[PDB]
Every structure is written in structure tokens, then in C-alpha cells.
Write a protein that binds this ligand. Structure first.
Ligand SMILES: *CC(=O)NCC1CCN(C(=O)C(C)(C)Oc2ccc(Cl)cc2)CC1
Ligand SMILES: *CC(=O)NCC1CCN(C(=O)C(C)(C)Oc2ccc(Cl)cc2)CC1
Ligand SMILES: [Mg+2]
Ligand SMILES: [Mg+2]
Ligand SMILES: [Mg+2]
Ligand SMILES: [Mg+2]
Ligand SMILES: [Mg+2]
Ligand SMILES: [Mg+2]
Lengths: 5, 236, 236, 5
């Protein structure tokens, strides 16, 4: 899964 | 609201304690109570709100993915029929997740966004609106899936437009917004080229403005820039 | 009970799914529903029950300790008065913890223990009874603290007596019971010598019986023996 | 904290 903030 | 009798300051204090204790459900409930007092939130308070719900929904999303994977396998050829239980339990978790998303969207609509005039607050809330519609999109399979996706897109786009006009390219809210909208493109909108373009342009424009920053601001910006790079590495 | 309309088998199935998803509150609720069907639990089912509540209460205990530490610091000389919020929130978490303990004790009393005739089931449940009174003891500060402690001791002692008569010294339930009663002595009963004696004797008697075991049984026993050794190392 | 199971 890609990074989110 | 069960928090209606507690002081705003006490709710904030307890949200901070709940964070220290890793009691994110409690933290979220306290912050919901604080919002419902009706006063605008400071920067620190906005962060408490976002941290709390991010942790709550983050756990729900992880569980939903476990359960959806099991359900998927159950529907492969040669899988033994095990009855309705996997679907029912995935539905339960899904409904609780949607409920959390609706609660957050409700707070933003009543009335956080409309009272947020400064760019930093308005962009922060609109990013959240995009994020929680994105989480709704992740589990959407029906007639409204398109409209949910468009709701996410519209919120992100308004945030982007304001952030480009009003904030420097190294601003951590602007960076984190771009990071997440890029993921929206890749994972939700089936637009990997758009995702990659966005992450690259955002990274490069931030790089060029790093020279203007203090050591502390530099740390904050470069941390998010590394997340953009991590995604780009994943996608290329 | 909200689980009253769900099949026993469906509750068990869902407890297993909840475990996979790390949804321990759900897992515990499903297992509570299963117990309340009124049938005895198999070994696998007893383990689902214990895993679920151990995880739930384990999280509550960790949070309670964070909050109690903060509260302790607030009552040191030179600490600024911050109002009732830390005490109130520690109380909230404490009350929820006590509630979970009371729920588990309730299940054991109605009617798991009285229907458990085989040594392995009766010892398993009595160990749980000791453990959940121990958790109550950890937060007890009042008039009943002695009686809570004695309740834990009495349950552990009955379990010990049965386990010594009826199970081999390498039996993992017997080992885990001894491990926990040893911790009861050290941490609750202010009896570190008793704790150390118990852990040592249990370890040595298990060592001597390892030769009788299959490779698989050997793995299970030696794992718990290592926990006894770890405690002994901590305490000496 | 000591080990329990
Ligand atoms: C009120 C305010 O300015 N909040 C934003 C800050 C930005 C930096 N924060 C972070 O934890 C990291 C992960 C470095 O970056 C973020 C987090 C959250 C968002 Cl929305 C953007 C960037 C603390 C909150
Ligand atoms: C029904 C039954 O026999 N349950 C007990 C087993 C013993 C081994 N288990 C374990 O996970 C380890 C940690 C190795 O040891 C334990 C766990 C729990 C207890 Cl009460 C004692 C020992 C699986 C359950
Ligand atoms: Mg007031
Ligand atoms: Mg649904
Ligand atoms: Mg562009
Ligand atoms: Mg039936
Ligand atoms: Mg109390
Ligand atoms: Mg002895």
C-alpha cells in the first residue's frame, strides 16, 4: 500500500 | 452528545491523555465533543482531531482488507461453501467504518469547513474531506461509487487550488494533500499517470524551495518529500 | 444478549475471523455469545475465549498503567495543578477494565467452572478466574483489595492442586498456571521468595519429564519453561 | 513486567 498522511 | 457536559478544555486535555495511552477511540470521541462545542479549532487541536480519526479508521481499513481477502478466496473455484458468516462479518466491519467516515464528514460539514477562512485551516479540512470520501470509496461497490469518488476528487481539488495559491510549495499541509491526492489518483481513480505526475511535480517544486527554510521547517518538509519519493519508487 | 439470535457455530466462526483481523473486542463478544449458548467449550473454543479477553484486558491494563503513571507524577511536589481530568480519565479506563474482568468472571461462574469436570478444562477455567481477579487486584486500592487478592489466590490454589494431581509436570496448562501464580506471588502478594521457589521448582520438574514427550509436545512445554526462566532471570 | 500467559 502507498504512503498517505 | 455524551460529551455535552464536559468543558472544551477538559476534552482537549483528555484527548491528549488518550493519545498517550493509545486509546484512539476515546481520543476521537473527546475531539468530536470538542468540535461540537462550536468554536473553531487551533492548529494543535486540528491535529488532535485528525490523528484520532486516522488511527480509528486506519484500524478499520486494515481489518476490512483482511476480511475482504478471506471473502475473495471463498468465492474462488473449488473453495468449500462456508455459509454467510464471512460476508456478514465483513459487512459489519464495513458498516462501522462507513459510520466513522460519516461522523468525520459530518463534523467537517457542521460546521468546520464553512467557518475556516485561513488557508491553512481550510486546506487541512478539505484534505480530510477528500480522505474520508476516499475511505468510503475503498469499500464502495454500488450505484453511488461514482458519486463517492467524485466527492473525494472535488474536495481534494478545492484544497489543491487554495494550497497552490496561498501556501509555499514546501508547506507540509500542501505536501501531504498532494501525497494523498496522488494516491487517490493511483488507487481510486484508475489514473496512475496523473498520480505519478502529481507526486513528481510536487517533489520537484518542494526541492526548489527548501533553501528558504529553517532547519526545523526543512525537517518537516523533507519527511513528506521522502513519502512522495517512496510512492514514486513503488510506482515506477 | 445481542448474540442471542446467532448460531453457536457462526459465533465460533466469526471469533476466528475477528482473531485474523485483530478485532479482539469483536472476538470477545462473539465468544461471550458462544458461552451463553450454555454448552461446554472444546479445547479450541476455550482458547478462543482466553485469547480474546486476554488481548482486550491486556490493552486496558497497558492504558491504565500509562494513565496511573501520569497521575502519580501529577501528585509529586512541584507539579502544577491541572485539575481533575487525569484522575477522571484513569477512573474511566479503570472502570471499563473492571467491567471486562467482571464479565469474564461472570462467564466462569455462570456456568463454565461448575460444568467442567475434566482436569484440563477445570484447571484452564480456574487459572482464568485467578488471572481476572489478579487484574482486579492490580487496580484495587480500597476496602476489598484484600478479599480480591484472596479470591485470586484461592482460584490459583485450587487450579494448582488439581494440576499437580492430574496432569504431568510438562503439561502446558500446568506450566502456564504456575508461571502466572508465580507472578501473582511476586507482583500482588508481596511474596517474591514464594514466586521464585515456584518458578524454579516448576521449571526443574518439567525439565525432568521432557524425555517422555514427542517433538511437538516438547516445543510447547519448552516455550513456557523459557518464560519461567525469563522471570527467574528478572528476579535474581 | 514479568511474563504471563
Ligand atoms: C495545524 C497544522 O499545521 N497541521 C499540520 C502538521 C504538518 C506536519 N505534521 C506531520 O506529522 C507530518 C507527518 C510531518 O506531516 C503531515 C501530517 C499531517 C498532514 Cl495533514 C500533513 C502533513 C504534523 C501536522
Ligand atoms: C485447550 C488447551 O489445551 N489449551 C492450552 C494450550 C496450551 C499451549 N498454548 C500456548 O499458546 C502457549 C503460550 C504455548 O502456552 C499456553 C497458553 C495459554 C495457557 Cl492458559 C497456558 C499455556 C495454546 C493453548
Ligand atoms: Mg465552558
Ligand atoms: Mg455494505
Ligand atoms: Mg498539473
Ligand atoms: Mg442452534
Ligand atoms: Mg475506581
Ligand atoms: Mg511448594
Amino acid at each position: 500500500f502507498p504512503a498517505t498522511v | 452528545g455524551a460529551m455535552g457536559s464536559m468543558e472544551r478544555a477538559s476534552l482537549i486535555q483528555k484527548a491528549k491523555l488518550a493519545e498517550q495511552a493509545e486509546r484512539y477511540e476515546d481520543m476521537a470521541a473527546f475531539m468530536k465533543g470538542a468540535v461540537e462545542k462550536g468554536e473553531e479549532l487551533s492548529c494543535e487541536e486540528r491535529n488532535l482531531l485528525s490523528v484520532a480519526y486516522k488511527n480509528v479508521v486506519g484500524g478499520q481499513r486494515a481489518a476490512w482488507r483482511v476480511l475482504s481477502s478471506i471473502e475473495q478466496k471463498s468465492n474462488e473455484e473449488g473453495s468449500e461453501e462456508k455459509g454467510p458468516e464471512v460476508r456478514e462479518y465483513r459487512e459489519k466491519v464495513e458498516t462501522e467504518l462507513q459510520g466513522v467516515c460519516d461522523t468525520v464528514l459530518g463534523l467537517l460539514d457542521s460546521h468546520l469547513i464553512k467557518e475556516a477562512g485561513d488557508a491553512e485551516s481550510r486546506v487541512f479540512y478539505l484534505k480530510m474531506k477528500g480522505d474520508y470520501y476516499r475511505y468510503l470509496a475503498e469499500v464502495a461497490t454500488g450505484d453511488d461509487k461514482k458519486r463517492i469518488i467524485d466527492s473525494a476528487r472535488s474536495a481534494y481539488q478545492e484544497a489543491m487550488d487554495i494550497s497552490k495559491k496561498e501556501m509555499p510549495p514546501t508547506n507540509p499541509i500542501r505536501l501531504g494533500l498532494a501525497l494523498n491526492f496522488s494516491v487517490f489518483h493511483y488507487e481510486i481513480a484508475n489514473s496512475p499517470e496523473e498520480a505519478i505526475s502529481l507526486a513528481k511535480t510536487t517533489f520537484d517544486e518542494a526541492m526548489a524551495d527548501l533553501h528558504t527554510l529553517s532547519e526545523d521547517s526543512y525537517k518537516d518538509s523533507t519527511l513528506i518529500m521522502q513519502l512522495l519519493r517512496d510512492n514514486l519508487t513503488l510506482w515506477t
